[PDB]
Design a binder for this molecule. Structure first.
Ligand SMILES: [Mg+2]
Ligand SMILES: [Mg+2]
Ligand SMILES: [Mg+2]
Ligand SMILES: [Mg+2]
Lengths: 284, 282, 282, 284
């Protein structure tokens, strides 16, 4: 992707037909370039209805997910491949251009001990098979590094790149998230530097998942480093005003992240757009 | 507690006799004013050996714990009270001045939904009983706010203050932790601002539990805000370097937090001391 | 002075009748609580017209100036007192509540050596006389610390407080400016900390005099520290956008500080108001 | 230059023979790679004495200056060329590898109005001639952007690059200074970004000229952006513990920048070395 986008938890809990209507209508009011749609219940997504909305309103889209425990790639790789194939097909059917997020495991996945080579070997096989299926449907895959409490396998930019090189495909990119990097990166710019050759998507998410510009993320370091590495991918907001039920346990939003979507979008999006112009990011 | 201290996890998580000696030796090496003693198994602590060590070396101390699952206050308050009474007595008998930490629950609590009045009612009953026991032994209790993933009940300075007000004791204080605040506070200074009437203790920990000064924590805002509220409590350095593996895994340490002790202590403690001097906490 | 205000330089440096109307119109457009009126030529100010504008539009005001070279307090104290008395009377008569700024000297003072006791004695004699005149008219005086290149005498919060103590008046306060503190203070919060007992006014200005929020000022540390000291004075936005060229050149503006008013006010004012809300100054 | 260095105002007020002895001894105690020597009194410099000190102690060096008013390039270009030729020759004779700083004007230079094309024409002619003379002596020239109060002509990384492109000499590099960028750059990383193709030297100088790490400079943004652009030049401290008399009026140090040299070097150098390590700067 390119330009500015929003994860649709800003506006709807589930990507059902009324939720798709609500999210797409809210998106055009902010003049964003794309939306990111959760692919958490693929058989439940009405792809024809979503595609019609996206094309009517000239909105691009990608999808993201976390794997359900029955299909965690680290331990149940055959089930993961089957699940990812379903999710890839539905993403392509609605006009999405990539499937990203925690496509290699669960949001809330934790064995209780550090990750093992056997787990990474399983993940690499899953992603290799999924990337071939994605290629057959004309979409790319994204691997999002998330913090230690949401997954034990891929937490940093450097680990995400290590997995992309372990898999050896040509259609998997790295997806970073400033909320996760705020915990995981030894200096937030290091995550961007480490991922630079594969970085195509970033969640500009505040440290408490609230309003960008009004938490602890080091935004000037983030934007300066994105400009320096020539970042030209998707800049996407992620604030859990609404919480998709299938990932609520893992995402740990126990209290409102902000007053409402009007506060987050009304203050956060102008802040991020202004920072992108300030540091001269490509496309700004 | 006043001045600079260290949480002894970098040398000792099991407070047995050689572990106590090892941690006191480190405290003298780094010229700190106090130590924080983790109590993984309060019944096993030799109170007289530790008391003698502290007095001989002019070191002050407090203790900290998190409740085990069999005694999580929100659901098993009678067992929480029993566990806390033992820890309070051991703390007092070794010469400690407070028991702090996750004394209201455990690492690993998560319901998937917001905390409830029923849960908070049980925590308040536990903390009231524990505060009474602590007062009878002449020590205080600290409530450490921890991030959303560790516990769903007390995550912010403002939530910690709400619980202290709900209990209505006068010997419970707020314990903040810059690693947790880096996630939970809407601007890191707001945790200190919200807790200012009750803040007596802060863990100075980097955002990745590594070396203070070399992460994402907003140290200038932290120290300026501490100075502005006139903070004179404990400045306690905390790093997860060299934690025993089983403890580290329980805290979601899946990879090294830093290179070694010389990196963490040789760079992190001077950074924190220098910042405290810069902003007049000294 | 309380709440949010603007220095009117962005619309009016020459406070004549159309300029006063222009600035008050801008103040209502941006829904501020007060304006700061620069007084380049105090005798030319129509006090009755300005007073009626402020009362009709429910606007509060203060005034500011820097001393011209013919009246630099450090070297020409009697001329400085005559100049300040005229400015104080004009301020009081138009309804302003204080005269602040570089009232102790001028932009462009520099001896090449540290400030001397002789200079500070002259400044103190000037300020003492001016403060008594201000008290007789019911207004206060503000001393604005400015950076080393503008004036060699009062650069930090701690220097400003020392001058307030040297003068010994009770109606002189400290006026800080985030642009100057960005250069002068050893950690920006230290200027607020050092001035805390006397700080009643702060210029919120970006590091390049452009758009607040989009430079190098440490806004989170600034706002957290203001909240922590209980700041209840004036929060006054200052930008050099659209200043008259001759005034701008005297302030070392050699190139545009920002694109236009819409960039500065449309991005910078919401940023500052949002930060004030975030840290509970509101 | 490469590695870590120190401007010798840390240790001596003038580069006389006793001052050279003291500064070189101090530089070895801190194990820095080079020193930066003010070339403010070229006829007074004992070049063989300094050259012998540097070679004996395996220390590299460069020189810096500001032009005296009698030879300000923007208004007296012929005098400026003659002065720079003298300074270039002394720099080369003592073993220095470059002459940097405000080689295009004065520290404290101010007309009262914005810079004009005629002034830039004069600087360009001066630098072109100085660049050829520097080439003949085998050294390079650096152009340091300084803040609006020290010079009205070159204040930003982008302005410095514009001059270097205008002159067209490949032996002139850009020299940035975090103390100056703290005022001049709209986000400090923008100075590094704008200068990335020509940046070979940076003063890591705190916002009040005191101890690095204990002022207002955005060090994490600075180091992350330097790493992102692949900076491989000199990282040099500048703290005016001692003040060269010829530039004191322009540098505006009216009160101690720090307690003493041991405080700045004892706390500031480890901080900067640690940050360079943290962000993986080339050569650290
Ligand atoms: Mg994300
Ligand atoms: Mg802690
Ligand atoms: Mg001002
Ligand atoms: Mg310099």
């Amino acid at each position: 992707m390119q330009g500015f986008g929003v994860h649709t938890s800003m506006w709807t809990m589930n990507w059902d037909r009324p939720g798709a209507e609500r999210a797409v209508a809210a998106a055009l009011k902010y003049e964003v370039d794309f939306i990111e749609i959760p692919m958490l219940n693929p058989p439940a997504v009405d792809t024809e209805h979503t595609r019609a909305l996206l094309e009517k309103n000239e909105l691009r889209a990608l999808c993201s997910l976390g794997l359900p425990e029955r299909a965690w790639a680290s331990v149940r790789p055959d089930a993961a491949i089957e699940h990812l194939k379903v999710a890839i097909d539905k993403t392509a059917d609605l006009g999405g251009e990539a499937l990203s997020g925690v496509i290699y495991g669960g949001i809330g996945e934790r064995t209780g001990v550090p990750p093992t080579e056997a787990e990474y070997d399983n993940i690499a096989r899953v992603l290799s098979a999924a990337a071939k299926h994605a290629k057959s449907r004309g979409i790319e895959l994204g691997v999002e590094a998330v913090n230690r409490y949401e997954n034990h396998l891929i937490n940093t930019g450097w680990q995400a790149v290590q997995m992309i090189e372990r898999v050896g495909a040509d259609n998997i990119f790295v997806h970073l998230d400033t909320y996760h990097m705020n915990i995981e990166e030894k200096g937030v710019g290091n995550g961007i530097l480490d991922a630079r050759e594969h970085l195509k998507y970033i969640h500009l998410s505040e440290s408490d998942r609230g309003t960008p510009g009004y938490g602890t993320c080091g935004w000037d370091e983030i934007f300066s480093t994105l400009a320096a590495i020539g970042f030209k991918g998707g800049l996407a907001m992620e604030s859990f005003i609404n919480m998709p039920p299938e990932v609520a346990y893992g995402l740990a939003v126990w209290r409102p992240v902000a007053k409402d979507e009007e506060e987050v979008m009304g203050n956060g999006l102008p802040f991020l757009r202004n920072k992108a112009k300030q540091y001269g990011l490509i496309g700004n």
